[PDB]
Design an enzyme around this catalytic site. Structure first.
Site, mmCIF file in Angstrom:
data_model
loop_
_atom_site.group_PDB
_atom_site.id
_atom_site.type_symbol
_atom_site.label_atom_id
_atom_site.label_comp_id
_atom_site.label_asym_id
_atom_site.label_seq_id
_atom_site.Cartn_x
_atom_site.Cartn_y
_atom_site.Cartn_z
ATOM 1 N N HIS A 43 0.786 -1.227 0.000
ATOM 2 C CA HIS A 43 0.000 0.000 0.000
ATOM 3 C C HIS A 43 0.819 1.279 0.000
ATOM 4 C CE1 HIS A 43 0.193 0.264 4.556
ATOM 5 N NE2 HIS A 43 0.082 1.552 4.290
ATOM 6 N N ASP A 99 -0.549 -7.426 1.903
ATOM 7 C CA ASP A 99 0.038 -6.094 1.787
ATOM 8 C C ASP A 99 1.560 -6.259 1.793
ATOM 9 O OD1 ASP A 99 0.326 -3.343 1.718
ATOM 10 O OD2 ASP A 99 -0.298 -3.035 3.816
ATOM 11 N N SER A 200 4.161 2.092 8.035
ATOM 12 C CA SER A 200 3.927 0.984 7.100
ATOM 13 C C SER A 200 5.159 0.551 6.364
ATOM 14 C CB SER A 200 2.875 1.411 6.079
ATOM 15 O OG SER A 200 1.614 1.398 6.681
#
Ligand SMILES: *C[C@@](*)(O)[C@H](CCCNC(N)=[NH2+])NC(=O)[C@@H]1CCCN1C(=O)[C@H](N)Cc1ccccc1
Lengths: 252, 29
Positions: A43, A99, A200
């Protein structure tokens, strides 16, 4: 990273920062798995709902960094990307299932006291270490609190316990899958801490009690808010996606 | 596994970082 602490120098030599070239923008974290491959969250590269879809030429990575308020001459290294590979079944439309993404560097990076790869888990490691109650470590330059400085100058670190899957599932209305795990303290456990926006792609690592090595068990993926009682951060289950990683690297 | 996951400034020097023992102890608790 919320409620974490400054990392000691060289404590996470596989730490990688992913940057947008123009304008300059720190986008996410990542990890070094060999002298030419970097692991991160898909992402961070592709998320249509936010009009995000980067190509190799839009980005760069910084390796071997500790503090953002100091130019670490001849220690930190900037690297350009040769190719990005996003998992083909990465579910950006719903819950960020799978992800994960790999990025190949144009040129190999030289290891040093500050740049060194993390190990990826194998079957035995995943079976022995990925268990509820055991703690792993998350690192990043992401937000210090749920918001929007507020961003740290020095790399932050926080240790967090893996949470039982039924607890993970009941803590959110988002559909969880076997390609994820969650971590964080439960209400009134005496401690706090969480990854947050900006973290992330960063690694969730665990130290083996058998061979003293650090294994990257997860990738910071998503959450709802940061550090809220009763909510837990979610991570891409690296071992579950190991076959895909190997496939990509073997074929490049 | 070559040299993966062994930090030059920690494991390679027989030095522990400040919180890794919390991780090892979590395998009990
Ligand atoms: C991309 C990362 O920097 C960030 C990490 C957030 C970690 N949070 C906690 N508390 N550990 N991920 C995100 O911001 C992802 C990208 C898509 C939206 N998102 C979320 O975490 C939302 N807050 C929730 C969500 C929405 C859609 C699909 C999955 C999760």
């Amino acid at each position: 990273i919320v409620e974490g602490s400054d990392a000691e120098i060289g404590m996470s030599p596989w730490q990688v920062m992913l940057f947008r070239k123009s304008p300059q923008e720190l986008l996410c974290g990542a990890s070094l798995i060999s002298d030419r491959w970097v692991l991160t969250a898909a992402h961070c590269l592709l998320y249509p709902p936010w009009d995000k879809n980067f190509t190799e030429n839009d980005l760069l990575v910084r390796i071997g960094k500790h503090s953002r308020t100091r130019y670490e001459a001849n220690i930190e290294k900037i690297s350009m990307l040769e190719k990005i590979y996003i998992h083909p079944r990465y579910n950006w439309r719903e819950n960020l299932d799978r992800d994960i993404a790999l990025m190949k560097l144009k040129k190999p990076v030289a290891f040093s006291d500050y740049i060194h790869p993390v190990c990826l888990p194998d079957r035995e490691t995943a079976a022995s270490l990925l268990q509820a109650g055991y703690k792993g470590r998350v690192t990043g330059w992401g937000n210090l609190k749920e918001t929007w400085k507020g961003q740290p100058s020095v790399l932050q670190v926080v240790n967090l316990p893996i949470v039982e899957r039924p607890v993970c599932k009941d803590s959110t209305r988002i559909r969880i899958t076997d390609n994820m795990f969650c971590a964080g303290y439960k209400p009134d456990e005496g401690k706090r801490g969480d990854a947050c926006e900006g973290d992330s792609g960063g690694p969730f690592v665990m130290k083996s009690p058998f061979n003293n090595r650090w294994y990257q068990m997860g990738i910071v993926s998503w959450g709802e808010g940061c550090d809220r009682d009763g909510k837990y951060g979610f991570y891409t289950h690296v071992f579950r996606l190991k076959k895909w990683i190997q496939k990509v690297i073997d074929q490049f | 596994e070559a040299d993966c996951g062994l930090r030059p400034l920690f494991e390679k020097k027989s030095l522990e970082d400040k919180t890794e023992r919390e991780l090892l102890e979590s395998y009990i608790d």
